[PDB]
């Protein structure tokens, strides 16, 4: 009756014309109004195969977010190695807003409603929707910020667990807030996390993960190398680019007081959006503060395991399309 297929999707949001925050404006131009009354049909007697690691929707969302960052986070200067271009450096105000993805005529989205679907394989509980849930396009590393949560209990997602080159995304079942501040009166900054909630969630994630490695001892370590965007929790807050040391986050011995991360805001960055360093203007004055919900983590498992104990996991930036995978995982476009 239908077949797997790719196609051109359109976006939908609650962006308002009066609102001048950059994403919101981009949405009033690129997107349409969110469905006032969504319709989700679930039918018994059907089975479908899903593969989130090979979902074209990820590529499309990727192109949009690249488009969004090209007209909103236009930098003061670009060093693309082949050239160095100067250009306006507009002050940036943005908060991501949820964006819904929808299908054109003659296509449709399938939604997997298995409460413990790990991301690959056949699905039993299948439904049909014309649009995804509202997804916030948070570009971040190490930590997945402001995403959806597991309905039942923590879930480990990966294309091949064994394959150490396959990205691991942990999908928490209960989010933990991260408070980031830069006082006024310059590049210094800090983050705050409740040690108790966090560490509890670590106990739980390590037990589930271990559950997937034949009960062998699981240990965490800081990144082994690489660019600053990867080795630190990196994200864009109120137009500023934060880079926080997470060394402190993965502290083996306490497994509680509220732990606080040292962060810095940078003007020179490696664009994720492609290649080259971008130079933004100096950090504006005034106290700057982002409070986000940690809902996921990206990890890379160390190679050359050898003796059974001590799998070593490093929070891993991997590829940003993985941020989109972490939200798009349960959907697929099929062609009627």
């Amino acid at each position: 009756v239908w077949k797997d297929a790719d196609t051109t999707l359109f976006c939908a949001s609650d962006a308002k014309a009066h609102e001048t925050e950059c994403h919101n404006v981009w949405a009033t131009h690129a997107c349409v109004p969110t469905d006032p009354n969504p319709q989700e049909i679930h039918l018994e007697n059907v089975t479908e195969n899903f593969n989130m690691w090979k979902n074209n929707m990820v590529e499309q969302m990727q192109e949009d977010v690249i488009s969004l960052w090209d007209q909103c986070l236009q930098p003061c200067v670009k060093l693309t190695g082949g050239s160095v271009i100067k250009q306006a450096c507009p002050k940036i105000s943005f908060d991501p807003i949820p964006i819904h993805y929808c299908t054109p005529a003659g296509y449709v989205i399938l939604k997997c409603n298995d409460k413990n679907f790990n991301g690959t394989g056949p699905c039993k509980n299948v439904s049909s929707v014309q649009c995804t849930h509202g997804i916030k396009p948070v570009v971040s590393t190490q930590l997945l910020l402001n995403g959806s949560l597991a309905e039942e209990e923590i879930i480990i997602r990966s294309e091949n667990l064994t394959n150490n080159a396959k990205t691991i995304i942990v999908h928490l079942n209960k989010s933990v807030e991260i408070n980031c501040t830069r006082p006024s009166n310059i590049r210094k900054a800090y983050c705050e996390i409740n040690g108790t909630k966090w560490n509890k969630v670590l106990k739980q994630v390590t037990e589930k993960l271990k559950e997937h490695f034949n009960n062998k001892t699981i240990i965490f370590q800081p990144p082994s190398g690489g660019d600053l965007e990867i080795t630190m929790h990196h994200f864009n807050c109120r137009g500023e680019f934060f880079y926080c040391n997470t060394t402190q986050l993965f502290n083996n011995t306490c497994i509680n007081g509220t732990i606080t991360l040292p962060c810095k805001i940078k003007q020179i960055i490696n664009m994720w959006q492609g290649t080259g360093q971008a130079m933004y203007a100096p950090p504006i004055d005034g106290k700057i503060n982002c409070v986000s919900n940690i809902t996921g983590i990206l990890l890379t498992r160390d190679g050359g395991a050898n003796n059974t104990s001590n799998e070593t996991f490093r929070p891993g930036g991997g590829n940003i399309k993985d941020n989109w995978r972490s939200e798009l995982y349960k959907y697929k476009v099929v062609q009627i």
Partner: antibody
Amino acid sequence: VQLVQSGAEVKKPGASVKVSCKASGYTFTGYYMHWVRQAPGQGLEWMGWINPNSGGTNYAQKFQGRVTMTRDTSISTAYMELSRLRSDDTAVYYCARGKYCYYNWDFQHWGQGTLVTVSS
Amino acid sequence: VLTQSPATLSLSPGETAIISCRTSQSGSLAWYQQRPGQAPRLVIYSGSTRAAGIPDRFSGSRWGADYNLSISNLESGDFGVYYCQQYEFFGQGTKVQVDI
């Protein structure tokens, strides 16, 4: 596709070594770069990989703490530095890339190799 | 780990060589050939699939943990040492040499 490594090296124990690997004929940033060595009387031994766009790395665990992988995208080159050399680090060091298509392990392309002799 | 056997193989041209490899983990197993003084060249992947420029003389077959690489009708280019591979792990190698 071509992969060209720097030439042979002789070092004293405790010294460090830096091997280069120049890639051409493909999008350099597009594919993980692995390193694999082969010491005499030893089988082939994988050391680690780097993700070129990121500069991110994974290392074979026995190699933690003494191996450094980096790259210079401006010249499509990967670098492997091995510090605090021991005599049983005497080996041919190779850089390798995944098969064109990807699985990323099937090692379709190899550098010509760089010989490193470590001896007092 | 990866156990490759036999350790050594002394054969005449024309004959067929049978190398075996034991894994304990399932997944893609590959075979490499390394000629004296050259970089290894990929010979087989997925346990059974030949690569580019690899002639019919080379063939792989598989049974459970056991993996076989079979090289039929040996010729001068074929001699060297062979490795089985699974993800980041390699076998110890099998040196196949000529004794006319």
